[PDB]
Amino acid sequence: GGFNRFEAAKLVMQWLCNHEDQNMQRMAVAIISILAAKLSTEQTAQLGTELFIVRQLLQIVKQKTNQNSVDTTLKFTLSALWNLTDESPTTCRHFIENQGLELFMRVLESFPTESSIQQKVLGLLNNIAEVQELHSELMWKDFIDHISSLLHSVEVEVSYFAAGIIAHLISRGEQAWTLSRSQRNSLLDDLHSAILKWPTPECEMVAYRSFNPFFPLLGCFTTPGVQLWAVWAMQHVCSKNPSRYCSMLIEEGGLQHLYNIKDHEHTDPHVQQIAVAILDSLEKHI
Amino acid sequence: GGFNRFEAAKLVMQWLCNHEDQNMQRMAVAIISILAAKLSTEQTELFIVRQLLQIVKQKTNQNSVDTTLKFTLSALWNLTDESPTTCRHFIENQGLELFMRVLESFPTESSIQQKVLGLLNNIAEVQELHSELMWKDFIDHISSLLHSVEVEVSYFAAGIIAHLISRGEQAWTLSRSQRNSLLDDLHSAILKWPTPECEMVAYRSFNPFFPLLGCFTTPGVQLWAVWAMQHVCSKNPSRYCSMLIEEGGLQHLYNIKDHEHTDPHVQQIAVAILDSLEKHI
């Protein structure tokens, strides 16, 4: 026997990241980014665990945050972290276990004017928010206050992700809300208010591999804010790229969840309007 | 969720190809040339091709023959290998005009000319882009490069001419008199070539050569194809002899050897390859 199939890649990766020549660090981040973007969600989870890529990227985020840099390396480091945590609870837990949450609050606090950095940070945290085992770790009052403030950002590609975090946290019910119930109730109201003011974004703000994490949100009839965010999200990606997303919605079972909303008697009007809109475009997908 | 993976990949490539740090740009373009050569073909990137063409343009505007330009031309050369779609994308983005401008700017840089002609040899292989190569200035420039005393330059100019001539006389829409001169010059020029010191090229497949092998009425075309087979078979026998055989090269070469009125120089080289393929026991 000898050491495992991944140790060579692991020690080259580390040599690149810690090199005096900053071009080697740019190399590693470019490599990680392109593999995060071409490989499948299970290869990236495998490789992410074996090379400890979450820990490696988080230490570049820290260095960049200490230097108050905001360069292209930091942007691709964060978008890699975002893409690796996509549909990957094991990667989301590596982030939490490496002080990712404290570090990302540092990032949001140090760069409050850099909306594309905030987008990448809140998109990652939106993925943590989808993992129920990780819900305890996000109930940190400083974090809820900060993202409750980002919820009212005028940039939709920032507030969209703040709203996603809030929507998932509220959707687990008071049983799991460890702060005051009044803040959760008022967050729920702000969630619903904020979403109704959103312009149609010009670009796609986000890409999804699966609609699964949205389906528990669609059944939350006693928290319309949570439902509204889910159906607004679906409406946004489906309307912007129906080839990829409409077929994905149907195949994963979206139709029962949408008809359940339409048919449900007492339904928030805004939730109902967007649901039937999604249903009717899905219907022309004959 | 995450960011659009296709757009992330392009943004990374844009960041490294166009980077202000020139050591980083040179590295990126070096890595892209290696990966294009080692990955499998097609499954297309046309975005990289536009980025690389931009760098060629800049290096021509600044009139600098440097390693970055050579790596960049190597990258395009390797991206067009057996990739008709990438070739077409090259044509559609003014590539023929930009390369003419490189040939005219660096008429003494053989390193540059080889990489340029290597890529154009790849377009010449694509029957559907043939009419894109019937350009008088272009055929005029490479027809004189056919006679360069550097075989790593003339070898690829010969290949362009061989493929274009192979398509027959109706397909040739420039002056028929030139085509006729080119026919004789192709055969005459090849007989003068010394043995190259190094491998000039790598091939994933012999398939583009097989049509040339049956051009008995245009023996310069056949002579280019067999001289090329002989060259890579002799330098890299472990790769090319086995590839020739497995793709049916003994049949194509015996058809030449057993053809009655074969140009003697074509016959000479076909039997050498045939013998060398067979000592490859």
Phi, psi (rounded to 5 degrees) for B174 = -90, -170
Total structural domains in chain A?
Answer: 1
Q: With beta carbons less than 8 A apart as the criterion, state whether B119 and B80 touch.
A: yes
User: Which residue among A26, A85, A206 sits closest to B24, beta carbon to beta carbon?
Assistant: A26
Nearest C-alpha of chain A: how many angstroms from B99? 30
Cross-chain Cβ contact A27/B23 below 8 Å: no
**C-alpha torsion sign, points A35, A36, A40, A44:** positive
Whether A123 maps to a domain, the answer reads yes
B3, B21, B23: residue with CB nearest A83: B3
Residues of A in contact with B12 (CB under 8 A): 30, 33-34, 76
Asked if A76's CB is within 8 angstroms of B11's CB, the reply is yes
User: CA of A35: which chain B residue's CA is closest?
Assistant: B9
**Residue A165, in any domain of the structure:** yes
Contacts with A30 from chain B: Cβ below 8 Å? 12, 15-16, 28
Segments forming the whole domain that contains residue A152: 6-284
* DSSP state at residue A98: T
Q: Is residue A131 part of a domain?
A: yes
Determine whether the interchain pair B2/A33 forms a contact, defined as Cβ–Cβ distance below 8 Å.
no
Residue A1 within a domain? no
Residue A243 lies in a domain: yes
Inter-chain residue contact B5 with A82, CB threshold 8 Å: no
**Spatial separation of the C-alpha atoms in residues B155 and B152, rounded to whole Å:** 5
Q: Would you call A126 and B6 a contact, using CB atoms and an 8 Å cutoff?
A: no
Which has the closest alpha carbon to B73: B118, B139, B133? Answer: B118
The chain A residue lying nearest B2, using CA atoms, is A83
DSSP state of A173: -
CA distance B53 to B29: 12
CB A210 within 8 A of CB A252: yes
- Return d(Cα B105, Cα A20) in angstroms, integer: 38
Round to whole Å and give the CA distance between B43 and A14.
31
Taking the C-alpha atoms of residue A57 and residue A98, their distance in angstroms, rounded to an integer, is 11
CA end-to-end span of chain A:
56
Q: Please name the method used to determine this structure.
A: X-ray
Sequence letter at residue A46: Q
Determine the distance in angstroms separating the CA of B15 from the nearest CA of chain A, rounded to an integer. 8
Task: State the DSSP string of chain B.
Answer: -B--HHHHHHHHHHHHHT-SSHHHHHHHHHHHHHHHHHS-S----HHHHHHHHHHHHHHHHTT---HHHHHHHHHHHHHHTT-HHHHHHHHHTTHHHHHHHHHHH-TT-HHHHHHHHHHHHHHHT-GGGHHHH--HHHHHHHHHHTT-S-HHHHHHHHHHHHHHHHT-TTT--S-HHHHHHHHHHHHHHHHTPPPPSS-----S-SGGGHHHHT-TTSHHHHHHHHHHHHHHHHHSHHHHHHHHHHTTHHHHHHHHHH-SS--HHHHHHHHHHHHHHHH--
Q: How far is CA A262 from CA A193, A238, A277, A280, in A?
A: 21, 18, 10, 11
| 3-state SS, residue A207 | strand
Contact partners, residue B258, CB within 8 Å, separation at least 6: none
Q: Which residue of B has its CA nearest to A213?
A: B1
Amino acid at the residue A65: T
A141-150 vs A115-129: helix crossing angle, rounded to 10 = 130
B89-117: burial string, b at 16+ Cβ within 10 Å, e else: bbeeeebbebbbebbeebeebbbbbbbbb
For residue A82, give both structure tokens. 């975002």
Interchain proximity A83–B4, CB inside 8 Å = no
Contact yes or no for B1 and A126 at CB 8 A: yes
What is the per-residue burial (b if ≥16 Cβ within 10 Å, else e) of B2-12? Answer: bbbbeebbbbb
Domain assignment present for residue A189? The answer is yes
Please report, for the domain that includes residue B51, its CATH number.
Answer: 1.25.10.10
C-alpha to C-alpha distances, B98 to B71, B138, B206, nearest whole angstrom: 16, 11, 29
Cα B25 to Cα B33: distance, rounded to the nearest angstrom: 12
Expressed in angstroms, the distance from the first to the final Cα of chain B is 57
Q: What does the alpha-carbon distance between residue B258 and residue B248 come to, in Å, rounded to a whole number?
A: 16
Answer yes or no: do A37 and B5 touch at CB < 8 A. yes
Show contacts of A16-24: CB within 8 Å, 24+ apart. A17/A56, A17/A59, A17/A60, A23/B21, A23/B23, A23/B24, A23/B27
